[PDB]
A paper describes a structure:
Though less potent for LgGUS and BdGUS, 4 still inhibited these two GUSs in the sub-micromolar range (Ki = 270 and 440 nM, respectively) and was selective for the two bacterial GUSs (390- and 240-fold more potent than for HsGUS, respectively). Likewise, C6-hexyl UIFG also was 1770-fold more potent for inhibiting EcGUS than HsGUS. Furthermore, EcGUS contains a narrower aglycone-binding site than LgGUS and BdGUS. Taking the comparison between EcGUS and HsGUS as an example, the aglycone-binding site of EcGUS is surrounded by five hydrophobic residues, namely Phe365, Leu361, Val446, Met447, and Phe448, which are located in loops 3 and 5, whereas the site of HsGUS is surrounded by Ser485loop 5, Tyr505loop 6, His509loop 6, and Thr599loop 8. The alkyl substituent of the inhibitors therefore facilitated an increase in hydrophobic contacts with nonpolar residues of loops 3 and 5 in EcGUS, e.g., such as Leu361, Phe365 in loop 3, and Val446, Met447, and Phe448 in loop 5. Interestingly, owing to the longer alkyl chains of 3 and 4, Phe448 rotated outward in EcGUS/3 and EcGUS/4 and thus increased the hydrophobic contact area. This additional hydrophobic interaction might have compensated for the binding energy loss owing to the absence of the water-mediated H-bond network, leading to the observed lower Ki values of 2–4 for EcGUS compared with other GUSs. Similar to the previous trend, the entropy contribution of 3 and 4 increased with the length of alkyl chain (–TΔΔS2–3 = –1.32 kcal mol−1 and –TΔΔS2–4 = −1.34 kcal mol−1 for EcGUS), while the enthalpy contribution decreased (ΔΔH2–3 = +0.04 kcal mol−1 and ΔΔH2–4 = +0.99 kcal mol−1 for EcGUS).
However, intestinal bacterial GUSs cleave the attached glucuronic acid for use as a carbon source, allowing potentially toxic compounds to re-enter the enterohepatic circulation. However, microflora-encoding β-glucuronidases (GUSs) are notorious for reversing the glucuronidation to release SN-38 in the intestinal lumen and thus represent the major cause of undesirable effects. GUS contains a deep enzyme active site (the two catalytic glutamates lie ~12 Å below the protein surface). To understand the underlying structural basis, we prepared C6-propyl, -hexyl, and -nonyl UIFGs (2–4, respectively) and resolved the eight X-ray crystal structures of 1–4 bound to EcGUS or Bifidobacterium dentium GUS (BdGUS).
Numbering used by the authors:
A (entry chain A): 0 to 206, 208 to 366, 369 to 599
B (entry chain B): 0 to 195, 197 to 207, 209 to 228, 231 to 238, 242 to 365, 370 to 597
Amino acid sequence: HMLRPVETPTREIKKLDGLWAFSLDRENCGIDQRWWESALQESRAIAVPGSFNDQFADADIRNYAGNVWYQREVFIPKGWAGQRIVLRFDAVTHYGKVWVNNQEVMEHQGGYTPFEADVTPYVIAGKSVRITVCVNNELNWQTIPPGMVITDENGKKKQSYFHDFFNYAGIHRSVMLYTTPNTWVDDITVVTHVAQDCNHASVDWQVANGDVSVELRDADQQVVATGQGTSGTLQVVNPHLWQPGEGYLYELCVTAKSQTECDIYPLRVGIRSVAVKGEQFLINHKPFYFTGFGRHEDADLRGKGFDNVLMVHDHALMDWIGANSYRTSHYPYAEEMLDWADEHGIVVIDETAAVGFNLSLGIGFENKPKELYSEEAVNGETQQAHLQAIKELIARDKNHPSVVMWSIANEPDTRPQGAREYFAPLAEATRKLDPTRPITCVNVMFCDAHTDTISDLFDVLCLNRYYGWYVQSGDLETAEKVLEKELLAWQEKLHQPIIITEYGVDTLAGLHSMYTDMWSEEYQCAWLDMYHRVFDRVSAVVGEQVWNFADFATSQGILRVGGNKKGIFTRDRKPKSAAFLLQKRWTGMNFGEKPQQ
Amino acid sequence: HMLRPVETPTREIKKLDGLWAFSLDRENCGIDQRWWESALQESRAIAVPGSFNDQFADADIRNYAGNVWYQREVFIPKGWAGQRIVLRFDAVTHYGKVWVNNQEVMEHQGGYTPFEADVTPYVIAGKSVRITVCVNNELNWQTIPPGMVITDENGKKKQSYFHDFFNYAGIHRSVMLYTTPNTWVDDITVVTHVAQCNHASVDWQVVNGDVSVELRDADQQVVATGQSGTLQVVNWQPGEGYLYELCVTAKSQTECDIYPLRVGIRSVAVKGEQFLINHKPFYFTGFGRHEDADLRGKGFDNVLMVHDHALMDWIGANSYRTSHYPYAEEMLDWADEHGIVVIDETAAVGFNLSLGIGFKPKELYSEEAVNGETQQAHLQAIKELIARDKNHPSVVMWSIANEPDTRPQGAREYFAPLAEATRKLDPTRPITCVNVMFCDAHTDTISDLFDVLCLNRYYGWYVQSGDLETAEKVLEKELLAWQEKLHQPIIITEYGVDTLAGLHSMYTDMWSEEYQCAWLDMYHRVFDRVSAVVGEQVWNFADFATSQGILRVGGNKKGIFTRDRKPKSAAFLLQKRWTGMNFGEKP
Ligand SMILES: CCCCCC[C@@H]1NC[C@@H](O)[C@H](O)[C@H]1C(=O)O
Ligand SMILES: CCCCCC[C@@H]1NC[C@@H](O)[C@H](O)[C@H]1C(=O)O
């Protein structure tokens, strides 16, 4: 049971603020020598939140595999003698184990979701405790995402993985201590139903030794509904709906009264209905059309570290270009992202970190498990770890009205028997963990309409298609034919709504061509344009998401010229020519509505 | 009187949690309608700290001149009923006025220094107060740095100024709320002396409480102790940078307050052709810098500081100049705490009307331009810099201004009071004023009111363009001319050439990486031949944003690094020189 921290009977002191002591451990003696005991040797200042790889311009820190130590002292605020205090890590990429002054208090696997522990017994209010963090950036076959650690003859660990983006690690987001009353709200769940768009209710179901009443206050803070019951309610309402263009928010505030002290938790709600009918995706009983991007949490110097200016600027760009939706590509994003999405009515495809369950999308000319689904590779523990990743993503983003669909994985290889054996239970478990949202699994190119094995276990079909790029390279005529043929094949086979969640081409900013050859800005424009002409001719396609909003870092190889260049913007957010192409189509269309051509 | 908040009896909650409501005021009715009354509407989220220009990819926000509105609520923590609580803005670039629920708690002019006010009478602990800030980015002749606003025919403002870097504005740094005990230290002053194995550290810990001071070590084990005033003997170097800690106890019987403040034991002084740190002949190596970065403008960011310091350490720089304004206080904590030599400078740039582009007041020193009010604001800006960076050991010299025009009559009236007054505002640090190329040896009027004079020279770039043999001859002859003409130590605070990353040439044509390399090598060979100059700082460390014009290809491109911090070929050239010399000792 987890909620995002906020105010009044609750209060934060964040240690996000500032520089920590940081150290490597090339021989992994930190645990043996109990480094959490003393203040570190060999410590250098590092900034949190932020990846550790790019911060020191050193290829050895950058390419490190192992454990790293983050440590900082802090003064525990003194008006906190009688309240309950928690230590919350909003993300520690891959694995983290924390000591609060010689006392292990938490441990976590999963680099993208928050994890907290009550630390009341282990701290002296009014004085300073020392926080030590042990961070592991290693991936094996039971981590979400999977990878393999390669140890050379000399014990240097080098991490290989099967996804594009670079394996940035560290404390990527918020680290804070926050206090709730000893009687406190611990979890909230809100569900919205709507009929003729002027007439429904907000079911609730709450959970910590406190009798609870909930007021549903206005944007004007005018109250229009009231309930009581730990097992919640159905507050019935005639309302203004949370819509894609505007995203209205009521405020449902839950009051947890114990007979002495009280706690109250403010939770914003968007009144909207999501469903799939035939080949139509409907938000509030109207067929929506998705436009926008796959994104990444990547940026210069800070890696995957959260940054407010970046969020403000990237939403300004996305707003300008006319995007209405995005997918949290290949891991759960910072919650600040989803909060922004709620206030602005941005439609979001929420996705777990389950990427790389595929051993066919390689560079060439170089020792893998020859069976993807097996005891050596993706096995039962992997499945359990995956289900737990689904449970953490859902427990954190269930109430967000902007999250409109759950993505279980991205681009697994579905051809082997055992893909369906691995995925079907996860598809079912996910539906039972949130029956109010449709479910998806993003589908790779070579698992075509004929060969794919699991897409009928999901509500929406999300395709990643690169005809004319990785195959039929340079050939816009042939690729157009292939793309039309496979889209009609998919619509014939499943009669589900189709979103093209990935389509894009590597483009060097400033490379121009009078031909329309690959890597050129002219080719990025003509290729996106040919895709758009096809989408507009297939009734089932309800959504387009250009593969990347910006250029991002990847591991080194012959396929990646300083990373992935499929961005519409450069890594410093400057637009390639295709940006204006996109802006013309996406602002020239009626909002949320499929282009009539 | 100023110092940075810390936490043992005092406590901060920073409102730097960035997202504030933000709005323009294009018809300038915000003050009239008292927008601080209600929450701003027609408001959009903005990140604090950070400049407001570049955050929104909007050219109308970017080039705006006027007032902008920043607003955020905060819940004042309830364990704060009896202490004194202050609202601290570490910097609001150019002008700021704060309302804490209607009570206009402050004002500040001067965009690079902090300003704080006690807000206890106007705050109820346990609930949220509404914070409204009005920041103005406009410049006149009475501002630091100076500028002129011209209004076109339709009431549209265009802000013109005379310094290179772009006029970024907004809440550039920390906004923190911090609570002290009701008898509290308000200021600290420390001075260190050292002889040629032993010496003393004066203090003056201006507070309502008796004073006791502990000098704890890095072990925080005691080495001297006192009880306003001291002078203590003992029994901080560039490569290493040690720091002791004096802890101040303001002892009262009603309540107690304590302040921890770091100190560096080192001595700086000049004569002959030598600048000596702890009685040792220094050589400055390093950079002119800027607080500039993508999307955030001049906004402070910790990752940027960690990365840029990794870069300067790798390349072999031991020093930098806080070019054209006072930097982040955290900059100087890093420099003290890492032993970086810092030439500290105020925001006195653009006092010159002579090298703009081609294609205005007709005398610079007069009431129309540089007037008496300008004298006041300049003196006050010098004094705010002095009050905030007085205790920092890394500061090794103070820069009163950068690149004024000294040729018009009257420069010496404006300047003499500021040099006398500033020397009188700290005799423990030497003073300089950076002078432009065209005020050469024969022409310059004021180089003798300062302890060291710092030259910005660009021969072979703006003059003798491409002519590197001829430029060599000029640089050598006027360098020797300066050495004979004042026999002061000389630091070269600026030398660099615009270099487009990826432009390469089999000739050595301007704007090319080969040209930057060849030009820097020729300059370096030139200095190796003048006993007098004790400091080299390549002009800019990274490419930075400027206002638009035919001289600036998407900004200034003189950086050794690009704006995304990638090295040009010259970066390695510099590394070879600065790694190949013995530390602090020039060939
Ligand atoms: C032949 C199949 C090619 C799949 C390649 C498409 C990949 N999908 C996942 C994304 O994270 C990658 O960046 C994308 C790519 O490589 O740019
Ligand atoms: C004839 C030109 C005289 C030198 C003027 C050179 C200028 N000095 C001041 C710095 O702020 C500028 O960045 C520098 C430049 O080039 O960008």
